[PDB]
Design a binder for these strands. Structure first.
Ligand SMILES: [Mg+2]
Ligand SMILES: [Mg+2]
Ligand SMILES: [Mg+2]
Ligand SMILES: [Mg+2]
Ligand SMILES: [Mg+2]
Length: 160
RNA sequence: UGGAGAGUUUGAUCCUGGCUCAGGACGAACGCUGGCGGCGUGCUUAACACAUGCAAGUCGAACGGAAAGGUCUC
């Protein structure tokens, strides 16, 4: 009952005396589609096995995403090894304006209204890691107001 | 009120970094094809050389007059 997206599958190799031993990696995104998403790498000698391992890794590594009604609360910039991803909230009309990896992550997390731009490296793994880093950096109004005081010193027009 | 990427250096990897493509636009040209209407638009090159016709006249209520028409007129 989850949403699973396999993002990138590539064939890696290792050289031995005989020749090249091939294997497969399959980066997988898994999320409940509502507010919670996980990422798992996964790797094996066969594509379905790698996909499976990615699925269990992601499902074990679920984490929670702060939404404010179908979009993220405030703009953020996430930083992976060398991938840079910029996310900004948008009005309810907009869709998900994102690239491949970022779109996978956001649509599995259950985000409907986002402008996502990748500025650093183009590797899919690092783009995914930067996106999850930005989602970690995200904040909620309720604990920012808990940290500061008098939880009205913000702007909460919609609510619901 | 608005921002999408992909291919390509390696046995494989991650960076750096060029090259290339997917969009739009045109006072356009060319290829194939071609029913109609509405509204626009048409020498971007030789400020090269130009046949022909037309693109600046008007006033008799300023004037002397009488080539033309109309006149009473011989
Ligand atoms: Mg770069
Ligand atoms: Mg080399
Ligand atoms: Mg080597
Ligand atoms: Mg490149
Ligand atoms: Mg000219």
């Amino acid at each position: 009952n989850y949403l699973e997206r396999v993002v990138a599958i590539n064939r890696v190799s290792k050289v031995v005396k005989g020749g090249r031993r091939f294997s497969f990696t399959a980066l997988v995104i898994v999320g409940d589609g509502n507010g919670m998403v996980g990422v798992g790498y996964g790797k094996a000698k066969e594509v379905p096995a790698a996909i499976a391992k990615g699925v269990e890794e992601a499902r074990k590594s679920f984490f929670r995403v702060p939404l404010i009604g179908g979009t993220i609360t405030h703009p953020v910039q996430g930083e992976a090894a060398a991938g840079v991803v910029l996310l900004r909230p948008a009005s309810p009309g907009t869709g998900v304006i994102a690239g491949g990896a970022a779109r996978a992550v956001l649509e599995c997390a259950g985000v409907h209204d986002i402008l996502a731009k990748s500025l650093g490296s183009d590797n899919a793994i690092n783009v995914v890691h930067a996106t999850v880093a930005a989602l970690k950096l995200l904040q909620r109004p309720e604990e920012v107001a808990a940290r500061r005081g008098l939880p009205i010193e913000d702007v909460a027009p919609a609510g619901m």
